[PDB]
A paper describes a structure:
We report the characterization of a de novo designed trimeric protein, ABP, which binds the small molecule drug amantadine. The designed protein contains hydrogen-bond networks that specify the trimeric state and water-mediated binding to amantadine. The interactions critical for amantadine binding include hydrogen bonds from Ser-71 to the polar amino group of amantadine and a shape complementary binding pocket composed by Ile-64, Leu-67, and Ala-68. The design was expressed at high levels in the soluble fraction and was found by SEC-MALS to be a trimer in the presence and absence of amantadine.
We carried out crystallographic studies to characterize the interaction between ABP and amantadine. Crystallization screen trays were set up with the same protein sample with or without ~five fold molar excess amantadine (7.5 mM). Crystals were obtained in the presence but not the absence of amantadine, consistent with ordering upon amantadine binding. The X-ray crystal structure of ABP+amantadine was solved to 1.04 Å, providing a high-resolution view of the ABP-amantadine complex structure. The crystal structure overlays well with the design model, with an RMSD of 0.63 Å (TMAlign [Zhang and Skolnick, 2005]). The primary difference between the design model and crystal structure is in the compactness of helices in the amantadine-binding region and rotation of the amantadine molecule accompanied by the presence of crystallographic water molecules. In the original design model, the amino group of amantadine was oriented to hydrogen bond directly to Ser-71 in ABP, but in the X-ray crystal structure, amantadine was found to be rotated 60° with ordered water molecules mediating hydrogen bonds to Ser-71 residues in ABP. Amantadine is often bound as a tri- or tetra-hydrate with the waters associated with the amino group, for example in a recent crystal structure of amantadine bound to the influenza M2 channel protein, amantadine bound the key His-37 residues in M2 through water-mediated interactions. Including explicit water molecules in the Rosetta design calculations could enable the design of proteins that bind amantadine with higher affinity. In both the X-ray and neutron structures, amantadine sits at a special position on the C3 symmetry axis, with its adamantane moiety interlocked at the trimeric interface and surrounded by the hydrophobic residues Ile-64, Leu-67, and Ala-68.
Residue numbers in the entry:
A (entry chain A), B (entry chain A), C (entry chain A): 1 to 75
Write the structure that this text describes.
């Protein structure tokens, strides 16, 4: 099953990276707004989006750990 | 040695991801506090925790590079 | 071609991680400055550098996805 499981995990990684890119775009837009008009509200919003981007990164890294675990089997 | 080295590196990745999750939890708690009561102090603390989370991510990515390097040998 | 492509992708990952480390260093310096003398300007600058570090992380993760895709071929 390892090779097929790896195929699925690659699809999961692709999907998560599409989500991560959307997050990064939102974060970059919020940064542009912050730089244009700095304020407490713009700082908080930017931080919020930064934290969410980190969260998604952690999710991506967990999928990569599953790739490594499924690879070990055939190794 | 490559297959055994990969086993060790997977254990390192697991351990680092446990550390990353603890960091992300701390970061998310700091975000909640910031949103509840925004202030300069809460902003700095949240940024601090965000930077630490990035640091840990870089450490995780270096372990993944070692996975790729050890895989190449048997490739 | 998969094994050779993987060699190239490992070189790309190494290069990107050198860039990521330089970014993390800049980010950590900006954090130290922020903690020393907090201000709106120091907050924005730190956020800017944090976002850039996330951007580079996303680039690194895309290289790892290409590693997984090239591995699947020989799997
Ligand atoms: N074989 C691997 C390809 C990719 C990089 C590294 C960790 C995971 C994902 C498995 C080696
Ligand atoms: Na921030």
């Amino acid at each position: 099953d390892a090779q097929d499981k790896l195929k699925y995990l690659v699809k999961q990684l692709e999907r998560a990276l599409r989500e991560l890119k959307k997050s990064l775009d939102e974060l970059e837009r919020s940064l542009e707004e912050l730089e244009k008009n700095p304020s407490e509200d713009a700082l908080v919003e930017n931080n919020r989006l930064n934290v969410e981007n980190n969260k998604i990164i952690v999710e991506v890294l967990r999928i990569i750990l599953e790739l490594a675990k499924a690879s070990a089997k055939l190794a």
